[PDB]
Amino acid sequence: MREVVIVKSTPQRGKFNAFAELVGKLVSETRDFPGCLGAYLMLAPERNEQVVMHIWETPDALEAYLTWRADRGDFLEINEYLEVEQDFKTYQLA
Amino acid sequence: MREVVIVKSTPQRGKFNAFAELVGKLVSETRDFPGCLGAYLMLAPERNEQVVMHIWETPDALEAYLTWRADRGDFLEINEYLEVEQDFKTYQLA
Numbered sequence: 001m002r003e004v005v006i007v008k009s010t011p012q013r014g015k016f017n018a019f020a021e022l023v024g025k026l027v028s029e030t031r032d033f034p035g036c037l038g039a040y041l042m043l044a045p046e047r048n049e050q051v052v053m054h055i056w057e058t059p060d061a062l063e064a065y066l067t068w069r070a071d072r073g074d075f076l077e078i079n080e081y082l083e084v085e086q087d088f089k090t091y092q093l094a
Numbered sequence: 095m096r097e098v099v100i101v102k103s104t105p106q107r108g109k110f111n112a113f114a115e116l117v118g119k120l121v122s123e124t125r126d127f128p129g130c131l132g133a134y135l136m137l138a139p140e141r142n143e144q145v146v147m148h149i150w151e152t153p154d155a156l157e158a159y160l161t162w163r164a165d166r167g168d169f170l171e172i173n174e175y176l177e178v179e180q181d182f183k184t185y186q187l188a
Contacts, residue, residue: 004136006100006145024188040149042098042185051100051185053147055134091136091145094118 002037002055002093003062009050010083016045019081023050026075030054033068035061055093062090096131096149096187097156103144104177110139113175117144120169124148127162129155142177149187156184 011019024041031039035057042051056062069075078086105113118135124146125133131149138144150156163169172180 004134006136020188027188040098041188042100043188044183044185047183049183049185089138089141089143091138091143094114094121094135094137 001059002057003059004053004055004091004093005062006089006091007052008087009052009078010048011050011081012083015081016048016050019078020050022077022081023052026078027052027054029074030065030069033061033065036065095153096151097153098147098149098185098187099156100183100185101146102181103146103172104142105144105175106177107142109175110142110144113172114144116168116171116175117146120172121146121148123168124159127159129159 009019009023020041020043027039027041030036030052031054037055037057039052039054042053044050056065103113103117114135114137121133121135124130125148129151131151133146133148136145136147150159
């Protein structure tokens with residue numbers, strides 16, 4: 001199986017563009033992780049929503065990525081920018 | 095700008111796998127529609143959720159697609175398999 005993650009972020013008031021800059025770098029870091037087949041950043045300023053989607057060659061690769069990023073300062077910096085916890089969902093790629 | 099659509103579907107109970115077969119054919123049509131840069135079907139049976147994402151060269155191309163599909167029988171067939179209306183959202187691709 002290939003898996004897909006979709007993560008929806010809701011930035012704090014006044015921080016939409018700053019968060020887009022921050023998360024764009026994190027998306028690049030994700031794109032470069034071994035086994036990531038693609039990563040995309042989606043913006044809807046008028047809805048105060050940013051969505052990241054990434055595709056994984058194996059569940060192995062996804063899980064290695066999630067473990068690797070969990071304690072990293074760069075990924076953890078998102079907490080200073082978001083109003084509520086990210087909505088993180090995993091899917092099977094058909 | 096490139097644009098991305100994410101559409102979330104909630105199939106009627108007992109119709110998850112039938113819905114996946116029907117929507118898979120629609121995703122294939124979309125994938126090779128003029129201006130489509132990619133189309134993906136995501137399944138989460140345990141959440142009774144299916145998600146389609148597609149990427150568009152231009153907003154013009156997306157809008158031509160939405161107009162083209164609006165009255166087509168195969169796209170309309172989805173409505174008899176849905177528990178609630180689809181959640182359709184458009185984004186700017188960063």
